[PDB]
């Protein structure tokens, strides 16, 4: 057919794109559906039973966070495609579970398996995408496309779930979604064909050494703070809007829509703009624009007042992510051994920590401290961390550091 084998290496791009699409679709659709099921079942330790609502998000977030490094080691331990297929199967089993699912304790187990699959895919597919694309500009382009797929998934999720749920009922958004997962697996089984183990030719650097590299840490912190911006912004915007704006129910999706559209636009154009213009300066501008936008958000007074800053923050987080994703591969190729699993695991740890500590901590900080103060402190953190991206202009090579050490002693 169109792909008898990996005749086009863009087939791997398509695989990763649709995998991330389906993963964030599972992540987003269940969010408004959990409270309805929980309330209906409860109608038909109470403080614990209330904070367990946020424990829903915390479950997937923490499972992903814990699971990333083990998958990163596993990829170069035995090979790339097998973790992708295993994470596929785990995600499919979880997806089949959510629906038949009823009991709360089983639902948490289901979404924990979802997190296992999400982490495994986001590590293995990303690493294999980096490995097949050794060219810097092409790697940046394909990584921007994959992040654009992530953003488009998180944009399409909520209405896709809501329309089917309101049309048929409970299992409708889940069964067809699992069928799309099965179609992905039918593609994968012939595209990858991992019917034999492929041990890695070159041994990987220890993970502890990577955490000692300052530039990897700078890029990881940039990604972490930029994602924590929108992650913290997600819960607290509707409640503050209801408190001060005297608003209604339906403005919420329209108000957050600019952020997702701008994310989708940013991650697909800045993949090709960054290499032409410069990754470090792109990251610096992204951080600065994130800070300005988040600073401007509390000062607004009408919905039209919030239209512009959400567009700005989406655009800027898109720049930061699409410019700092391939710099991990660039650095590990420049001054380390060419194995990308561990470094991309670190990058995804930074990515997921924001979603992990966003909702609950932001709610608590809003409870004890003014929400405008939350936005201002986030903006201050972003602005003060922005100049640290300057160090990524021309990193020294491993030979240079060896010579520096030999001059020291």
């Amino acid at each position: 057919w169109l792909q008898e084998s990996r005749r086009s290496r863009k087939l791997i791009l398509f695989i990763v794109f649709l995998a991330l699409l389906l993963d964030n679709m599972l992540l987003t659709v269940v969010v408004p559906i959990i409270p309805s099921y929980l309330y209906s079942i409860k109608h038909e330790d109470l403080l614990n039973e209330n904070v367990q609502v946020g424990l829903l998000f915390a479950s997937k977030a923490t499972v992903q966070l814990i699971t990333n490094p083990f998958i990163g080691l596993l990829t170069n331990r035995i090979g790339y495609p097998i973790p992708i297929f295993a994470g596929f199967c785990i995600m499919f089993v979880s997806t089949i579970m959510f629906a038949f699912s009823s009991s709360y304790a089983f639902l948490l187990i289901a979404r924990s398996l979802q997190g296992i699959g999400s982490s495994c895919s986001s590590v293995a597919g990303m690493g294999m995408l980096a490995s097949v694309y050794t060219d810097d500009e092409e790697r940046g382009n394909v990584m921007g496309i994959a992040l654009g797929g992530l953003a488009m998934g998180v944009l399409v999720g909520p209405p896709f779930g809501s329309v089917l749920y309101e049309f048929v009922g409970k299992t409708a958004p889940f069964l067809v979604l699992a069928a799309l997962v099965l179609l992905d697996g039918a593609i994968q089984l012939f595209v990858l064909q991992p019917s034999r183990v492929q041990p890695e030719s070159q041994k990987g650097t220890p993970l502890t050494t990577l955490l000692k590299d300052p530039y990897i840490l700078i890029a990881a912190g940039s990604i972490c703070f930029a994602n924590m911006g929108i992650a913290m912004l997600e819960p607290a915007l509707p409640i503050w809007m209801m408190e001060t704006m005297c608003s209604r129910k339906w403005q919420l999706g329209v108000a957050f829509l600019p952020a997702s559209i701008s994310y989708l636009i940013g991650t697909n154009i800045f993949g090709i703009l960054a290499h032409k213009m410069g990754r470090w300066l792109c990251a610096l501008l992204g951080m600065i624009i994130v800070g300005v936008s988040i600073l401007c958000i509390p000062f607004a007074k009408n919905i039209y007042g919030l239209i512009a800053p959400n567009f700005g923050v989406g655009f800027a987080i898109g720049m930061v992510d699409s410019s700092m994703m391939p710099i991990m591969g660039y650095l590990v190729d420049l001054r380390h051994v060419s194995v990308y699993g561990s470094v991309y695991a670190i990058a995804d740890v930074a990515f997921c920590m924001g979603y992990a500590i966003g909702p609950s901590a932001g709610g608590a900080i809003a409870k004890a401290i003014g929400f405008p103060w939350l936005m201002t402190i986030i903006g201050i953190i972003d602005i003060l961390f922005a100049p640290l991206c300057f160090f990524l202009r021309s990193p020294p090579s491993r030979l240079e550091e060896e010579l520096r050490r030999r001059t020291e002693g």
Partner: nanobody
Framework: VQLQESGGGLVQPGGSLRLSCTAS???????????MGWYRQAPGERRVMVAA???????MYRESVQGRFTVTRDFTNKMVSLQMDNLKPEDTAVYYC?????????????WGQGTQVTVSS
């Protein structure tokens, strides 16, 4: 991989001298992959690094030699060379040539014949 060099001599303090090390036994591409410089050893003293260059073209001079030495590596002529503009009596040492190749973890080092320079006091 074999290398050659020339230089050395006796001169009063304040003079000038030029040292050049040649690498004609290895190809240009492998020469670019490697890193090279000039070694230094004194009677009854250990090696302490003075000036080396790499494919970044960055030379980390030792703290006391900044400005005193001048080193340049040729990517085409296969020569690493040193130029120096000032002398002091504390320069009693013997200078060697060397290379590093860090694609292997052992970074196989190959030394040159070496040159000795002493300064009258």
């Amino acid at each position: 991989v074999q290398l050659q060099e020339s230089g050395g001599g006796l001169v009063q303090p304040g003079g000038s001298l030029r040292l050049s090390c040649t690498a004609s036994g290895v190809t240009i591409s492998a020469l670019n992959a490697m890193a090279m410089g000039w070694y230094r050893q004194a009677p009854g003293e250990r090696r302490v690094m003075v000036a080396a260059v790499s494919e970044r073209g960055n030379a980390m001079y030792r703290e006391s030699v900044q400005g005193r030495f001048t080193v340049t590596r040729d990517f085409t002529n296969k020569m690493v060379s040193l130029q120096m503009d000032n002398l002091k009596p504390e320069d009693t040492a013997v200078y060697y040539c060397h290379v590093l190749e860090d694609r292997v973890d052992s970074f196989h080092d190959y030394w040159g014949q070496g040159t000795q320079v002493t300064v009258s006091s």
